[PDB]
Ligand binder design. Structure first.
Ligand SMILES: Nc1ccn([C@@H]2O[C@H](CO)[C@@H](O)[C@H]2O)c(=O)n1
Ligand SMILES: [Mg+2]
Length: 101
């Protein structure tokens, strides 16, 4: 079973180490530094890697930074657009920093 999923269009970015954080809402605020997590694709729940959580922090819509976007391998405009679709109306988020094992 997978502990967490990503949209499959992020799979290669994660395996290549271009994406090293993910921004989630309260439903995934329980992941914490030192967790070792099985990761699957959102679309088919297919496993593709195991990650280690290396850091966590809280962030809000109005405190997301260019650097958060860079670590998501996005522009900031791109990151805000994805959040507006995935977490409509939400402002409180949780940063999970990780590495692919
Ligand atoms: N920063 C983020 C936030 C969410 N997600 C994907 O969207 C699903 C629903 O939140 C999540 O389960 C996850 O698959 C993502 O890929 N990257
Ligand atoms: Mg959109």
């Amino acid at each position: 079973p997978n502990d967490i999923t990503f949209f499959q269009r992020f799979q290669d970015d994660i395996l290549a180490g271009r994406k090293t954080i993910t921004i989630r809402d309260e439903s995934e605020s329980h992941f914490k530094t030192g967790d070792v997590l099985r990761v699957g694709r959102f679309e088919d729940d297919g496993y593709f890697c195991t990650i280690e959580v290396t850091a966590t922090s809280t962030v809000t819509l109005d405190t997301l930074t260019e650097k958060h976007a860079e670590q998501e391998n996005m522009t900031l405009t791109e990151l805000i657009k994805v959040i507006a679709d995935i977490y409509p109306g939400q402002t409180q988020f949780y940063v999970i920093e990780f590495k692919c094992l």
